[PDB]
Amino acid sequence: YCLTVMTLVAAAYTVALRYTRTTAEELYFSTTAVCITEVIKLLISVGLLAKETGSLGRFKASLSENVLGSPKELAKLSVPSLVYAVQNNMAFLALSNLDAAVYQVTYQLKIPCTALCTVLMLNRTLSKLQWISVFMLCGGVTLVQWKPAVVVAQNPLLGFGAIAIAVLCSGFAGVYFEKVLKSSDTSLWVRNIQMYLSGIVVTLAGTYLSDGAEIQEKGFFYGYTYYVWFVIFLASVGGLYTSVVVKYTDNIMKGFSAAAAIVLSTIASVLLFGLQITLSFALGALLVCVSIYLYGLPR
Numbered sequence: 074y075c076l077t078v079m080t081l082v083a084a085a086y087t088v089a090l091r092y093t094r095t096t097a098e099e100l101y102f103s104t105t106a107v108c109i110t111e112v113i114k115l116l117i118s119v120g121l122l123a124k125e126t127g128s129l130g131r132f133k134a135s136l137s138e139n140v141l142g143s144p145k146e147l148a149k150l151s152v153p154s155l156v157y158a159v160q161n162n163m164a165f166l167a168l169s170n171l172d173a174a175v176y177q178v179t180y181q182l183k184i185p186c187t188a189l190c191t192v193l194m195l196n197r198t199l200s201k202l203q204w205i206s207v208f209m210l211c212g213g214v215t216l217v218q219w220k221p222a223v224v225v226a227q228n229p230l231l232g233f234g235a236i237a238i239a240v241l242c243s244g245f246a247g248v249y250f251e252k253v254l255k256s257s258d259t260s261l262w263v264r265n266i267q268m269y270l271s272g273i274v275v276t277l278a279g280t281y282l283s284d285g286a287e288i289q290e291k292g293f294f295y296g297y298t299y300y301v302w303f304v305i306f307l308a309s310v311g312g313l314y315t316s317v318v319v320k321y322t323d324n325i326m327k328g329f330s331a332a333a334a335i336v337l338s339t340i341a342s343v344l345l346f347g348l349q350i351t352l353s354f355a356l357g358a359l360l361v362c363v364s365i366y367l368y369g370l371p372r
């Protein structure tokens with residue numbers, strides 16, 4: 074379920090976002106959407122904490138001791154929420170200035186950056202063979218994702234600067250969260266709550282600084298339609314399900330699993346719905362399979 078959710082969210086999110094940034098008459102503030110995602114992800118996570126603890130007495134006790142009463146953990150988790158506030162704003166900026174396929178292939182440069190950050194920050198080791206598989210995975214998804222390289226005027230060079238920042242944020246913020254998540258027995262849903270508390274403050278401050286002038290003229294929830302709330306739900310679910318992947322695997326295996334699921338989803342579409350496929354897909358799919366094989370070998 075959590076692999077078929079991640080693909081159908083991955084498919085739906087970037088297309089629905091790209092649509093809502095280009096086609097609107099009354100256009101919404103992207104900074105607010107990033108902030109509202111952190112609010113919803115907090116409220117779902119608070120819900121999940123009650124379900125995990127499985128008791129009102131245990132839930133309340135967890136909020137006191139672990140959520141609100143672990144200040145140094147909130148201090149640590151304020152760092153990646155500041156970086157994710159950058160990242161997610163750069164993602165709305167990138168999809169406003171570049172094509173959906175162009176964003177997709179370019180943003181996979183996070184996979185090398187995330188692998189480097191994993192080796193740097195978590196003090197792990199990747200062999201020469203494992204490094205070969207990471208770049209081969211990156212080249213494999215490039216071949217699978219490839220598509221030709223809006224009703225509004227755009228700026229590609231500003232769009233690529235945004236993906237350059239967002240790629241660096243993806244590696245740093247994700248691995249920082251993994252570092253803090255796996256440093257104790259504290260629950261995933263506490264760590265998410267601890268993070269999204271600071272996130273809501275940082276993202277709301279971002280909105281003030283970026284769009285506060287224009288928001289006074291128009292309103293905070295200006296341009297919001299049924300499709301903007303759809304995008305934010307997908308961003309919230311995706312955000313939560315990403316933290317679950319990092320919990321049960323790691324920030325490198327997030328990339329391999331994401332790539333493997335794109336190939337499995339396209340193969341499911343060929344068999345069930347008679348989808349026509351390219352030779353680039355066939356070659357790229359094999360590279361994704363070899364990369365998983367090479368990464369999955371003992372040294």
Ligand SMILES: Nc1ccn([C@@H]2O[C@H](COP(=O)(O)O)[C@@H](O)[C@H]2O)c(=O)n1
Pocket residue numbers: 114157161183242243244247250265268311312313315316
């Ligand atoms: N603990 C975490 C870790 C990541 N996330 C979200 O998951 C996304 C990570 O995207 P990447 O996998 O592209 O780095 C970000 O939008 C981030 O806000 C989250 O909501 N909670």
